[PDB]
Amino acid sequence: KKRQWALEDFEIGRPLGKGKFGNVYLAREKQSKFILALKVLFKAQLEKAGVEHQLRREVEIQSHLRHPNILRLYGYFHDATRVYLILEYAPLGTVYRELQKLSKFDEQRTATYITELANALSYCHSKRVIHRDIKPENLLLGSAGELKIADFGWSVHAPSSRRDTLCGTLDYLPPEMIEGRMHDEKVDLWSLGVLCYEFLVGKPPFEANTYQETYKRISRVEFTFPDFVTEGARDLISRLLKHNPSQRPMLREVLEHPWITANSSKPSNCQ
Ligand SMILES: Nc1ncnc2c1ncn2[C@@H]1O[C@H](COP(=O)(O)OP(=O)(O)O)[C@@H](O)[C@H]1O
Ligand SMILES: [Mg+2]
Ligand SMILES: [Mg+2]
């Protein structure tokens, strides 16, 4: 802290993206000319939805984490109607957007994102911090195209129970999570498998037309591989998507998986 910011301190720019209770804008600090992102939240909306506490966890957890593959939060401020989170600006956008553009990624790009992701999560887990909402819309890209995990509104310390109502898609969530059961860091490992599959295939493994059917797919762990997915990718993905949390690999096992080391351009680091 030691810098109480206010809106007049920034020149607001173009909309970077859309959030649940406000948008994110590009912005520049008037004095230093530092470019960053401003996440805007409408108080009325936060309170009405009763998620004021997730915003609080997001600020406290993210402002304290320091890792190259984790989006920094510099601070916050608010006015009559709004809260503003000052974030590290991510120039290359979201992985969600990169996936819509390319339809699907090659093994090198996929393996490299998985490595950056695993590294980031390795650092979170060493503090028993579970992200629990790892989705491509929350995976951002730095100036070098490196992956950055953002949106810690669902993060919590492990072990944990689920007190909050789910809202969006169930696609990236493991069984223990969609069932409200107790859970831990292994939740993020399941999500990693879902991402690996979607990066390579172009759509998540349990995708279905309805919430009710997606829920069935996830519970029964019902997924199949298109012919083009290689043996190595199938192996890693099948290891990650295990119904029993304890059967899922440790991040180190993921980082040293032969298929990952063979295709990843960047080095692992859970060291
Ligand atoms: N630091 C950032 N740099 C660039 N774009 C961002 C940044 N933060 C968020 N966005 C964009 O805003 C969208 C929503 O932001 P997010 O922080 O996930 O809000 P919410 O908690 O409502 O989901 C993202 O999916 C992305 O498109
Ligand atoms: Mg988000
Ligand atoms: Mg959020």
Swiss-Prot record:
Record region (Activation segment): 157-170
Signal peptide: none
Positions annotated as active site in the UniProt record: D133 (proton acceptor)
Binding-site residues for ATP, renumbered to this chain: K20, K39, E88, Y89, A90, E137, N138, D151
Entry comment on modification after translation: Activated by phosphorylation at Thr-165; this brings about a change in the conformation of the activation segment. Phosphorylation at Thr-165 varies during the cell cycle and is highest during M phase. Autophosphorylated at Thr-165 upon TPX2 binding. Thr-165 can be phosphorylated by several kinases, including PAK and PKA. Protein phosphatase type 1 (PP1) binds AURKA and inhibits its activity by dephosphorylating Thr-165 during mitosis. Phosphorylation at Ser-219 decreases the kinase activity. Ubiquitinated by the E3 ubiquitin-protein ligase complex SCF(FBXL7) during mitosis, leading to its degradation by the proteasome. Ubiquitinated by CHFR, leading to its degradation by the proteasome. Ubiquitinated by the anaphase-promoting complex (APC), leading to its degradation by the proteasome. Ubiquitinated by the CUL3-KLHL18 ligase leading to its activation at the centrosome which is required for initiating mitotic entry. Ubiquitination mediated by CUL3-KLHL18 ligase does not lead to its degradation by the proteasome.
Protein kinase domain location: 10-260
Annotated effect of mutating D151N: Abolishes cilia disassembly and kinase activity
Reported effect, C270A: Enhances stability
Activity regulation field: Activation of CDK1, appears to be an upstream event of AURKA activation. Phosphatase inhibitor-2 (PPP1R2) and TPX2 act also as activators. Inactivated by the G2 checkpoint. Inhibited by GADD45A and p53/TP53, and through dephosphorylation by protein phosphatase type 1 (PP1). MLN8054 is also a potent and selective inhibitor. Activated during the early phase of cilia disassembly in the presence of CIMAP3. Inhibited by the small molecule inhibitor VX-680.
Catalytic activity, reaction form: L-seryl-[protein] + ATP = O-phospho-L-seryl-[protein] + ADP + H(+); L-threonyl-[protein] + ATP = O-phospho-L-threonyl-[protein] + ADP + H(+)
Glycyl lysine isopeptide (Lys-Gly) (interchain with G-Cter in SUMO2) cross-link, chain position(s): K135
GO terms (BP aspect): anterior/posterior axis specification; apoptotic process; cell division; centrosome localization; cilium disassembly; G2/M transition of mitotic cell cycle; liver regeneration; mitotic cell cycle
One cellular component term from this protein's GO annotations in UniProt: microtubule
GO molecular function per UniProt: ATP binding; histone H3S10 kinase activity; molecular function activator activity; protein heterodimerization activity; protein kinase activity; protein kinase binding; protein serine kinase activity; protein serine/threonine kinase activity
Induction: Expression is cell-cycle regulated, low in G1/S, accumulates during G2/M, and decreases rapidly after.
Enzyme class: transferase
Keywords, in A-Z order: ATP-binding, Cell cycle, Cell division, Cell membrane, Cell projection, Cilium, Cilium biogenesis/degradation, Cytoplasm, Cytoskeleton, Isopeptide bond, Kinase, Membrane, Microtubule, Mitosis, Nucleotide-binding, Phosphoprotein, Proto-oncogene, Serine/threonine-protein kinase, Transferase, Ubl conjugation
Tissue specificity remark: Highly expressed in testis and weakly in skeletal muscle, thymus and spleen. Also highly expressed in colon, ovarian, prostate, neuroblastoma, breast and cervical cancer cell lines.
Main localisation: cytoplasm
Entry-annotated residues carrying Phosphoserine: S219
Subcellular location: Cytoplasm, Cytoskeleton, Microtubule organizing center, Centrosome; Cytoplasm, Cytoskeleton, Spindle pole; Cytoplasm, Cytoskeleton, Microtubule organizing center, Centrosome, Centriole; Cell projection, Neuron projection
Other notes: Centrosome amplification can occur when the cycles are uncoupled, and this amplification is associated with cancer and with an increase in the levels of chromosomal instability.
Job of this protein: Mitotic serine/threonine kinase that contributes to the regulation of cell cycle progression. Associates with the centrosome and the spindle microtubules during mitosis and plays a critical role in various mitotic events including the establishment of mitotic spindle, centrosome duplication, centrosome separation as well as maturation, chromosomal alignment, spindle assembly checkpoint, and cytokinesis. Required for normal spindle positioning during mitosis and for the localization of NUMA1 and DCTN1 to the cell cortex during metaphase. Required for initial activation of CDK1 at centrosomes.
Subunit structure: Part of a complex composed of NEDD9, AURKA and CTTN; within the complex NEDD9 acts as a scaffold protein and is required for complex formation. Identified in a complex with AUNIP and NIN. Interacts with FBXL7. Interacts with CPEB1, JTB, TACC1, TPX2, PPP2CA, as well as with the protein phosphatase type 1 (PP1) isoforms PPP1CA, PPP1CB and PPP1CC. Also interacts with its substrates ARHGEF2, BORA, KIF2A, PARD3, and p53/TP53. Interaction with BORA promotes phosphorylation of PLK1. Interacts with CIMAP3. Interacts with GADD45A, competing with its oligomerization.
Descriptive protein name: Aurora kinase A
Organism: Homo sapiens (Human)
Lineage: Eukaryota, Metazoa, Chordata, Craniata, Vertebrata
